Amino acid sequence: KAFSKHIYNAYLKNFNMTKKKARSILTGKAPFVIHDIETLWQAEKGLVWKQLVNGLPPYKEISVHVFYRCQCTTVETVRELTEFAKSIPSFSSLFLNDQVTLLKYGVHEAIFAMLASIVNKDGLLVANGSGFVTREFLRSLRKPFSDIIEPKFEFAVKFNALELDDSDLALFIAAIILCGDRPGLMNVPRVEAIQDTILRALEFHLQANHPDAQYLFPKLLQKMADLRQLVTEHAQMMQRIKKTETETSLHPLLQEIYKDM
Template identity: 80%
Template sequence: MDKVEQPTSEMKCDGPVDGVTKGQASPRTDLKSVPILEETIWKAVREGKSASLDCGGMSDLQEPGSASGEEVEGSETSDAIGLAVSPGSKGSWGANLQNGDGTPQESPQQNSDTSVTDPLQAPSLSLSDQLRLGRDDPSNLGLNVECRICGDKASGFHYGVHACEGCKGFFRRTIRMKLEYERCERACKVLKKSRNKCQYCRFQKCLALGMSHDAIRYGRMPEAEKKKLVAGLLAGENLKSSSGADLKTLAKHVNTAYLKNLNMTKKKARSILTGKTSCTAPFVIHDMDSLWQAENGLVWNQLNGAPPNKEIGVHVFYRCQCTTVETVRELTEFAKNIPGFVDLFLNDQVTLLKYGVHESIFAMLPSLMNKDGLLVANGKGFVTREFLRSLRKPFSEIMEPKFEFAVKFNALELDDSDLALFVAAIILCGDRPGLMNVKQVEQIQDGVLQALDQHLQVHHPDSSHLFPKLLQKMADLRQLVTENAQLVQMIKKTESETSLHPLLQEIYKDMY
């Protein structure tokens, strides 16, 4: 099969890839580093030290010069996004293919131009280290913290809320002198320039926002507590009663972060799947021979080193894992750009990513799929669904549930701006086990959900029930991740030739 049939316009990307050919070399050069999280790294973070580990695996998007790794189980999701592994590294993440009888399959001649320097020697930041960036500089804390009453610059935490000197003094005088103001029914706006015009409305706003004499703090507030209070303000201060303009701004910010940090957008993927792009058509991987060609430079770069022989199913399983690792890195960077996320406790940031990354990946995966297969390696390859089904069990069972979910999810016809807010809402679920500040997380998610609801009303006016449908999809994704985790655990126990990437082990540890 040298070419897959071209879909018609009515197929809406649910047909085969247009003009996908099987013999065009397209060596990769856009490599990026993979983060790692291990117990030793956590220890180093707590002690204020730097730490790095060998990844033992590398995504096709990695950059020569870095590789460390953390782990999570259930990387099957990754299969779909782009398979990439580092052969010859510690942990045997790369692998030569074997025939069905276990004998090694002869490899085609490797293109010398596709060989790259082993990047596994250089350290990279752990997941927790990446999340800590920008948090430890005191100059970044407390800046632009507004008075909750009037919007002026807050001077501190007074009577239970962040307030400016003016509002602090006003509230103190009112309480101490037991002042009573003439009742006002106009619900006046209390702003910096107008805060003295209506004392009744100003005092009512102080009470409504939680100012209380009982909340007086004696002595100087510890710096650690101050940081947490500032974080709480920044996390969701403007999300309680966000206006339409505020929600639109939030949606735009989240969408920009999504497009910046996620390498394969739905718009890009669909243009490849429908042949509406000037880029080289993806190389079709439909059997062992075509997989070998892909491994030797047509889709993925072949790293230096002699990998051990592995059965084809095991090899594909490894490819899946490393793509998941790279996508976790992208999602981490995306999360850091969601307003309020980096102001959460570091523990809560890690917890949200631990429980949210696979649900997020499975939500993005349908963008790369049609009924016949899925794009891999940043669109340079297309793995057929039949080929994945042809793998022996249990490897053949990894991707099929994702295809079934994709059919229904793609029917919602979401675009990248919709997905950006949906993925952000998934990451910010306040019911994740072990969260230290649930209320703060829920505040941020509430704002994102409000923005998503408004965004859908504007951009999908004919789909009145789209928002509740997406809320149901969040529940479906949890079930999909649970089943995925169970399958990966089974593979881990029954397949002696397999091992899980450290990042995937860490993510799935104690999850279910």
């Protein structure tokens, strides 16, 4: 009852952008549309970003610049997700190496679930909602960069059909991070103990918030499974980038996440 309230606060306290904020911008009541090099360059000059251009790896080309912008956003979400996880009382009681194991495997799964909030069929929100990058522009980048984001979109449209809100997402993301199936886990029974409480809290919240919902709890358990498949494909693509594109830098933190899978 109070656990669900605690998880939601931790979410609101740590994430820079809610699904409520993202949806109101996407619908209305105006973000700068990025669709080519001229608008992408304009966004760099005009728009206020978190990681300033000077902090990014040295300029190479358009496709690699977008890849670098994605790389920073990923790493920053990883930082926000580490603080959110710590904010769960049970999670911080686990030995730090088990905390790392959970984050090494759940992080991209959580990222893709939250990505659905800023994503629609035609593109996604950037620079704290100030800008909007089109899907066709990402489609226009050189291979393999044009092939990374496509399965995320295919997930995001199906996931947004469930119409979940920020209080549902807080528990969904919590359940993803606290997973007992992770390789190299030391105290697997304790992580399973936390997971069960989170999943029980999610079930009871999904009836209170979504009473007319047709099978919402088992649908979200299947969505967690689909998310694991999406991360596997992502690491595979990322490993291929490291072999083929031997001039584009991969952030050491992400290189470690992808190392095994």
